[PDB]
Design a protein around this ligand. Structure first.
Ligand SMILES: OC[C@H]1O[C@H](O[C@H]2O[C@H](CO)[C@@H](O)[C@H](O)[C@H]2O)[C@H](O)[C@@H](O)[C@@H]1O
Ligand SMILES: OC[C@H]1O[C@H](O[C@H]2O[C@H](CO)[C@@H](O)[C@H](O)[C@H]2O)[C@H](O)[C@@H](O)[C@@H]1O
Ligand SMILES: [Fe+3]
Ligand SMILES: [Fe+3]
Lengths: 192, 192
C-alpha cells in the first residue's frame, strides 16, 4: 500500500547537525516501521483505498498512530535541508517578524515550547486562519493536519529517538542542530 | 528539598542487560533533572511540606509530571537487580499462576503490553484491591500510585531513553534484558 518516501538528501547531508547514524535509524527503521505497520492494518478495511491524509483525518487508535506518524515524519524530513539553516527569508521571515517582533524572539519562543514538550511529541510552526504564524505542541502522533484553520509550516520531532544518538538528554543541543538545518524553502512553500 | 536516591547497585551491575552508560544518563541525568525541576516548582505552592507520594497523589501539570517521574524512576531502579531475573518465587510466583495460569503466559501478556505501549510510557505489574495481579499501561508520567486501592508491584520504563543507548529501536531486546534483571524480592515485598 504505502511506501517509505526517499530522504530528500543524502544520508550524511545533515552532518554534523544530525548524524548519518541517526538518519539510518530514524528514517530507515522508525519511519519505515510505521509504513509497515499501517500497510499491515488496512487490508480489507474502509481505509484500504484512501490516501494517507484521508486516513489520518478519519481514523483513531493504531491506524491513526501509524498513519499520522508516517505523515509527520515525512513532514519533518522536509523541514530539514543541507542547504537550510540561518536566517529566515521571504514571506515567512516577514510573518515571523509580524508575530514575534524578531527572528531571535521567535527562536526563543519555539525553543521554550520544544524543551518543555513533555514526553514523545512534536513542536510545530503553523499558520492560523487569520494568516498569522504560531507555535503549537502535539503529543505522540497528534498533528495539526487534523485541526481546521491550521496549516503546518515546519515541524521538529521531539520523540527521544530523534536526537538521543547525537545529543543524549540535551534537547537544547538538538535544537541548535535544528536551527542549522531548518528548511526555509519548504516553510515558504507551505506558507504560500 | 527532595533528593536523588542513590542507585541500589553499582553503575555496571546490570551489565550486559542495561549498560553503565545508560545508568549514567538515566539515573544521573534524567532522574536527577526531575528532582531539580520539582524542587524549583515547590516553593510558594500548596506542596511545600508534603511527601513525594502526597504530591504525586494531589497534583497536576508540571508539579505532577516531575514528582511522578521521580517516584516512577525510584520504583524502576528497585524493580531491577543484579541478582534478579529468572523465574518468579514466593507469593508473587503463585499469584501470577492464579491470574494467568503460568509464568510464561504472564510474561507473553506483559511483553505484548510493553511492546505496544505507544510513545513515552510505563508498563506495570500491579495488585488490585481484589487481591489479584494485573498488567497496566500508563503514558508519560502517569502511574498506578494514583489509582486508589491499586498497589504497584514492578514497572518497566519504556521511555526511549531507557533503552536507546543499548538497543536503539528494538524494544523486544530491551525487554529480554528486563526479564534478566527483574527483582522478584522487591515484587514480593510490595505484594506482601
Ligand atoms: O495499536 C495498538 C494500540 O496503541 C495504542 O494503545 C497502546 O498505547 C497506549 C499509550 O499510548 C497504551 O495506554 C495502551 O495500553 C497500548 O495498547 C492506541 O491507543 C490503541 O488504540 C491501539 O490499538
Ligand atoms: O511542566 C511544564 C508543563 O508540562 C506539560 O505541558 C507541556 O508538555 C505537553 C505534552 O505533555 C505539551 O502539550 C505542552 O504544550 C507543554 O507545555 C504539562 O501538561 C503542563 O501542565 C506543565 O506546566
Ligand atoms: Fe521520529
Ligand atoms: Fe526513564
Amino acid at each position: 500500500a504505502f511506501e517509505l518516501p526517499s530522504l530528500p538528501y543524502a544520508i550524511d547531508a545533515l552532518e554534523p547537525h544530525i548524524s548519518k547514524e541517526t538518519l539510518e535509524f530514524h528514517h530507515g527503521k522508525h519511519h519505515n516501521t510505521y509504513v509497515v505497520k499501517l500497510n499491515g492494518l488496512i487490508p480489507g478495511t474502509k481505509f484500504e483505498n484512501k490516501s494517507l491524509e484521508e486516513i489520518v483525518r478519519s481514523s483513531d487508535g493504531g491506524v491513526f498512530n501509524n498513519a499520522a506518524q508516517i505523515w509527520n515524519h515525512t513532514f519533518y524530513w522536509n523541514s530539514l535541508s543541507p542547504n537550510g539553516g540561518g536566517a529566515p527569508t521571504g514571506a515567512v521571515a516577514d510573518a515571523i517578524n509580524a508575530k514575534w517582533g524578531s527572528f531571535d524572539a521567535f527562536k526563543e519562543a519555539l525553543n521554550d515550547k520544544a524543551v518543555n514538550n513533555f514526553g514523545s511529541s512534536w513542536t510545530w510552526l503553523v499558520k492560523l486562519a487569520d494568516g498569522s504564524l504560531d507555535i503549537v505542541n502535539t503529543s505522540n502522533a497528534a498533528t495539526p493536519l487534523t485541526d481546521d484553520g491550521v496549516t503546518p509550516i515546519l515541524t521538529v520531532d521531539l520523540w527521544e529517538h530523534a536526537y538521543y544518538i547525537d545529543y543524549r538528554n540535551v534537547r537544547p543541543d538538538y535544537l541548535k542542530g535544528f536551527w542549522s538545518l531548518v528548511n526555509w524553502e519548504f516553510a515558504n512553500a507551505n506558507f504560500a
